[PDB]
Amino acid sequence: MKEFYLTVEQIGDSIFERYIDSNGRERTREVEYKPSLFAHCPESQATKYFDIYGKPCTRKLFANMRDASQWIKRMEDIGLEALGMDDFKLAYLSDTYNYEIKYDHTKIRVANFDIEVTSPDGFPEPSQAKHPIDAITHYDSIDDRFYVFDLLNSPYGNVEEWSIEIAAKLQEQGGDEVPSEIIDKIIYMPFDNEKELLMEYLNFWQQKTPVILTGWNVESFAIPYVYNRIKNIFGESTAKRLSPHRKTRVKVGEIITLFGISVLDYIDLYKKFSFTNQPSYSLDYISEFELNVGKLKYDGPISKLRESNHQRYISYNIIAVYRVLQIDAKRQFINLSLDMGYYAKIQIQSVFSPIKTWDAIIFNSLKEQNKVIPQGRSHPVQPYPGAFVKEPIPNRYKYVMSFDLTSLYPSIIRQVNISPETIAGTFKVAPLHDYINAVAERPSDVYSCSPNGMMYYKDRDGVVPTEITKVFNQRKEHKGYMLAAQRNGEIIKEALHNPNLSVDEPLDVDYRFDFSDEIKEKIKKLSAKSLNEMLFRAQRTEVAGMTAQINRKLLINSLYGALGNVWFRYYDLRNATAITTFGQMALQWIERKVNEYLNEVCGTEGEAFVLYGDTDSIYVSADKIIDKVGESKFRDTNHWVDFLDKFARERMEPAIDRGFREMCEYMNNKQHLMFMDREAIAGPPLGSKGIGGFWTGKKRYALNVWDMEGTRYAEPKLKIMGLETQKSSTPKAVQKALKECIRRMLQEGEESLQEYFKEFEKEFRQLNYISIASVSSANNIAKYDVGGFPGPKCPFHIRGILTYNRAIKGNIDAPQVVEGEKVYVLPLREGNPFGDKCIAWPSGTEITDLIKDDVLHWMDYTVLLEKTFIKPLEGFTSAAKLDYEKKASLFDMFDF
């Protein structure tokens, strides 16, 4: 098979690499890699190497990486550019694997683990690791087995072996409901003492050294804990065996790095490739959201679970590891990482760095062309203008249609041809609004321009534009294979309804391309076995395409980040500013065009149809459009929705393309790529007193959407942005009551809203105290505390945390409030035994007794309702010109 690398490391003058050889077996090697860097030479010197600016360069081969680094140091002192890939690991990978690498995941050892550490005195700090490790569950992808290390005797108790029979039984039967699909994949290993467990674990680790190591929070807890525990008991020399190269290091805080291993903490792979931003990121919360089943439940505090119910303790450890494997089975984020890393030829963990990923992609691309990359330069962090957001007029908007530009920044780079080596010059910049209204002199009739004053060559392809354009082509390329493979999805599926009993074999065709009609019906006459393999193959294909297509998308959207980053090799302040300023002009330019077109077709004069714009989207009020045809002439909702849809497709879009076409010629851009697509269509139900939507201000609105990019909803979906209903700090009961308030406003009207509001006020005091409590995170708690009391400028939540501390000062059983975590908050009436206006206890749990009964007795309902429900509702209703309460004065809306 085709060889590929697993991990790579640089230690001194050697490159340590683990990899899969042609035979498919994992191997390791040390190589005295000789790097090459470059320097500018004279034109008279014959060479084949040129920097991206066309300047000639001489290749300097060094005897070892240390000499290369030394040379770079000398060049900086002399003041002359040192060109080439200074990260020798990338160079080595590029040189060793100069070809599209095909990898076989079944050969990559992926370890998923989790440990448990009983601790009476609070969270067991990894940097100390003062407590024994009493449980370890380590899943290995190659053996597809769950290895469980159980400590029977510890200073905290002696227990009996864990029972797999009891683990499989149901809850009602005293069991742990450990899934039957892993029950046979568990290898149990009990131990008499801790030293025997760690040493057996460490030995196990040497025999099955992980390539990719993941799990939940493993980088911040499990890995550092295991490392330090071993180091503290045995020597550091023993702890270093956790690294296949016996080499480790420490980073920010207590982040241990194990050379020869790629750590991909699943908690990070989630906060990166899932894009959903959950309120909480605990394995329990995430597991519920993705699998509709969280971690195993248990009674009492975790610090006492091992001694009170060791059976459940071990099963809990095994489930925690399985949940992560289940989520991955759904998100496939590990597979993605591998795919992206192998694509850019970087260490798998670098996938977390857009800068490193793009650096490697451009580097390998330029290498094939014999070009030499620029030297990374030092750049002062300098803030520059970003996206444009229009200030909306607070109000209700009955009918709205939004339009979004596709891949704005990446497109702008291509259109204007922005790149460091394509910079051609500058021009006198006029006020941005002069360009938006096309009253300013045309910037240049020779170069491609950006409203910030930069001019670019049109006669040459830029390094960046070209590189981004290639990923765009690979995108539609792969998204084209799984597109046709989808067509074959029915040619094979439906071929099972009325096939034949002819015993045959599965044909050899490429599902990437449409099935040839010369073999089309040839398949509609095979056995039940082959046909079930014909669709099986079509699955691998239609799925493989997804990963590639998704990876290309992630790269495309992360390019701008890198370009704005001073640590990026191709960074340039002018270029980053050219991108955002252009985007700012484009959005406002098109806003002007849409208004101009809609006024003309409506006979109106200087009317504002665009009510809001943000970055690459605009929202248009369609009331005039609807009235132009009369609202009473529509049969139902779907009727006017079909009308606006049609009007957008055959009237607005063409007018938009014409508008952007003009802007491209005005800035004399290299190529027109400003494409807008109708996004949403929103409005109230036909025949209702509802208000399709409203805006309170920037980033704050709600719309009753009926259609999104062509897909018509059976029922209108609320699209809410920025309002408290979207805030994790908003109490549960209130978050849903605020949503129902908005739904009623958009779909049913004022009266319905007032009816609900009244009922909710009446029944507020009957809601669970946990559902009506706001949530917040405890930060800098030690910055505003003065001996149990609040210091100067002490936040409200933090003030409540202290009130809790004091009230529980002297109890170790009651839940303590740690830092950086989330906590519930509740206001208290004046004259409470807590001597404060509020109290806050840890989240996810109920108020410990001894104070619970009192809290419920002193909690201020009035203030709670007013502060979390009424205040924000009034914000929505004021903007929407609605009253949530009868007999409300009209003058209250005026300033004095």
Place this chain on the structure above:
DNA sequence: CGCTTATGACAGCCGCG
């Protein structure tokens, strides 16, 4: 090296018969 553009909940001034 794994940021902008924003809003809102509070705290703490200054000023005014």
Place this chain on the structure above:
DNA sequence: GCGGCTGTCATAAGA
């Protein structure tokens, strides 16, 4: 006592 400001802190998109 509140305005009308100036900070700190806490939170969402999208790239």
